[PDB]
Structure 1
């Protein structure tokens, strides 16, 4: 409970006490994140987009509606979208008509999506043209999906990659992606071993794999990879099968479909738990930590020190480095209280500007990781930070192009 409490306290998480139970956190029935949490999730999403889309020339972005055509025939559980008017129009405005009306709702009402797969399949022919039918290629999208709880509606941010490839290399690609995705979660982890995988198969015998994170109450699947075959793709283009073929060298084939879907929200919670260390400190990876640095003032002329801090902030923000402007506060807290709070907020570095600074331009820099302080000239702070971050980011990008198996 210490982790969730700290997170709610420091605004990584949001919600009432009833909304902070493990069940409520996993249901997705309420917006789980506070500002610092939204920032962390945004950074995670960015890292996903860089590794899966930006750095892979065969992967394109796709966007699809949150709502899908109504059917009800299959008897699925997706929520239906019903116009309040139509309901009012039949009410205040027979018994056999009411039943007919209800029958209509079920059969014709649109529904909220449960996965991002269909959005990709629907845009497959378009991307086929974009790449001149050359296989393999993928469609990526990060978006919210809905799922029924217990009658509550849960919302989950899904990160999806749908990979179209000839059947003959489908097995190898599934293995390539499983390895690539596992290493992606681990490069940001304090305890990489807490991120694991397990192979599986579906009711139809199709192979796939799942990635898990070991939460205190057990392992939860944060990502799944499935080798779906061509069934769903074929069903998406009835009567046009002859024209949805891609090129596998000199051969034309209906591609096999690999679906890779990660849960960004659960993944964000995963890093929060993974970063918690005992002084309570959250050691989120430098690329994920919402706030990179904090600027505060020590003893000395208020207005002048604040001015120096303001210049430093502008310079950092201009470099895209997030900054917590602690010097703006009433600052009636001790140094120990300040550092303990920053440690809980996962602030990478805290800087202290004082009278001395006005004299020899030196500032005190405290590292969240080691908690060791040290002097440095205010003119070198930007360079140190920019470099420290690039180095962390470069280490994490070590194997982004490694050819697995």
Structure 2
């Protein structure tokens, strides 16, 4: 078994049976891929996407849309089982009556969304109103999309749909291309492994794609398209006056750019990127992404007292939203060496050891993932040190 995926499965970044840890299974989205460490890593990534694209941008608003669309091409259809049963009860068929049923399914049944684009379009007229028709602006959503494989794969997509006058659309597309690529790179240990290329679709529309170089090859993690206006006009038949936005004095139907990232594949990219057979394997996930910031353990000494102290430190750090692994809670004894190796595989940023010394003089032993050196710190400072350290890494962007 490949080492990175093996470690990820052992440390609960990935879930699944061993056969589901193949490249094809991991890329298909046909099983829930992530275990608790992975779900947390992915939530951190999604939060960082939200910060960059919605929180820090006044012209981007959140949107939410259904998972199913009116029914498109290969998308699975939603069919009520009660309708099928109704049919299977009646003794006389036909072929006319059955074919009819099947025919009617193919034309009236809703279908699973393949992208988040249609949800943004359908909410455009309302956001336009909210912004008093001023262009440009965006609508953003993170949510699951469904993809026929070759079973239906599920992928978490982070979408920005940007509405701008056609005359600035090319400029906007290039701005998003650079910004999005820099966003992926800012969390990477090997930022050159995130690359980009131009592409064009079936219709000749221009776009770009962003890629991560996985061991087996490059996989697209984000696509950016200059869609023009057809999809928007397709959404609002007749009523054109209600979709025109202001470009200064001009009233115009805006051009639509779609900027869509694969949060799941992006999670897997950072897991591969983090792997350092440095020392023993370590996952050096970026501080803002690492699911566990600190681990707390008790050394040789008085069980119940040494744990009362860790509990207090845990509670303090959690009130401050710092994730903590309560190793002190464990029963089985494990060597310091074994602990550090595990924490390193889990991408834990700092490990803290509370000992009889601590009970005497209040000093803890603090070990860093990145340098791997141990320092003595007074328990009273730990919180401020950690709170400050994370804020520093998050400020870098």
Shorter-chain TM range is over 0.9
Aligned to 2:66: 65
Aligned to 1:86: 83
Per the alignment, in what secondary structure is the counterpart of residue 220 of structure 2?
strand
CA distance in 2, matches of 1:200, 1:10: 38
**How far 1:203 moved relative to its partner?**
2.0
Q: Name the TM-score, length of structure 1 as normaliser.
A: 0.96
CA distance in 1, matches of 2:185, 2:156: 20
Which stretch shifts more, 168-177 or 239-248?
239-248
Per the alignment, in what secondary structure is the counterpart of residue 50 of structure 2?
helix
Per the alignment, in what secondary structure is the counterpart of residue 259 of structure 1?
strand
Question: 1:13-67 deviations in whole A, cap 9, x for unaligned?
Answer: 0001111100000000000000000000000000000000000000000000001
CA distance in 2, matches of 1:139, 1:316: 35
CA distance in 2, matches of 1:21, 1:383: 42
Q: Which residues of structure 2 form unaligned runs of 5+?
A: none
CA distance in 2, matches of 1:242, 1:232: 16
Question: 1:276-327 deviations in whole A, cap 9, x for unaligned?
Answer: 0011000000000000000000011111110010000000000000000000
2:73 matches 1:76: yes
Per the alignment, in what secondary structure is the counterpart of residue 260 of structure 1?
strand
CA distance in 2, matches of 1:243, 1:284: 47
Which stretch shifts more, 380-389 or 83-92?
83-92
**How far 1:232 moved relative to its partner?**
0.5
CA distance in 1, matches of 2:247, 2:235: 21
Which stretch shifts more, 194-203 or 346-355?
194-203
Per the alignment, in what secondary structure is the counterpart of residue 224 of structure 2?
strand
Aligned to 2:392: 391
Question: 1:93-123 deviations in whole A, cap 9, x for unaligned?
Answer: 3221100000011111110000000000000
Question: 1:213-239 deviations in whole A, cap 9, x for unaligned?
Answer: 000010000000000001110111110
CA distance in 2, matches of 1:202, 1:143: 24
2:317 matches 1:316: yes
**How far 1:92 moved relative to its partner?**
2.2
Per the alignment, in what secondary structure is the counterpart of residue 365 of structure 2?
strand
Query: Which runs of 4 or more aligned residues in structure 1 lie more than 6 Å from their structure 2 counterparts after TM superposition?
Result: none
CA distance in 2, matches of 1:110, 1:252: 34
CA distance in 2, matches of 1:200, 1:15: 34
Per the alignment, in what secondary structure is the counterpart of residue 89 of structure 2?
coil
CA distance in 2, matches of 1:181, 1:87: 46
CA distance in 2, matches of 1:87, 1:49: 42
Per the alignment, in what secondary structure is the counterpart of residue 307 of structure 1?
helix
**How far 1:243 moved relative to its partner?**
2.2
Q: Name the TM-score, length of structure 2 as normaliser.
A: 0.97
Q: Which residues of structure 1 form unaligned runs of 5+?
A: 396-405
Per the alignment, in what secondary structure is the counterpart of residue 364 of structure 1?
strand
| Count of residues paired in the alignment | 390
**How far 1:368 moved relative to its partner?**
0.6
**How far 1:174 moved relative to its partner?**
0.3
Q: What root-mean-square deviation, in Å, do the aligned CA atoms of Structure 1 and Structure 2 show?
A: 0.7
CA distance in 1, matches of 2:128, 2:242: 10
CA distance in 2, matches of 1:242, 1:130: 16
CA distance in 2, matches of 1:213, 1:41: 16
**How far 1:242 moved relative to its partner?**
2.5
**How far 1:331 moved relative to its partner?**
4.2
CA distance in 2, matches of 1:158, 1:145: 7
Question: 1:338-379 deviations in whole A, cap 9, x for unaligned?
Answer: 000000000000000000001111000000111111100000
CA distance in 2, matches of 1:267, 1:184: 11
CA distance in 2, matches of 1:48, 1:247: 28
CA distance in 2, matches of 1:30, 1:272: 18
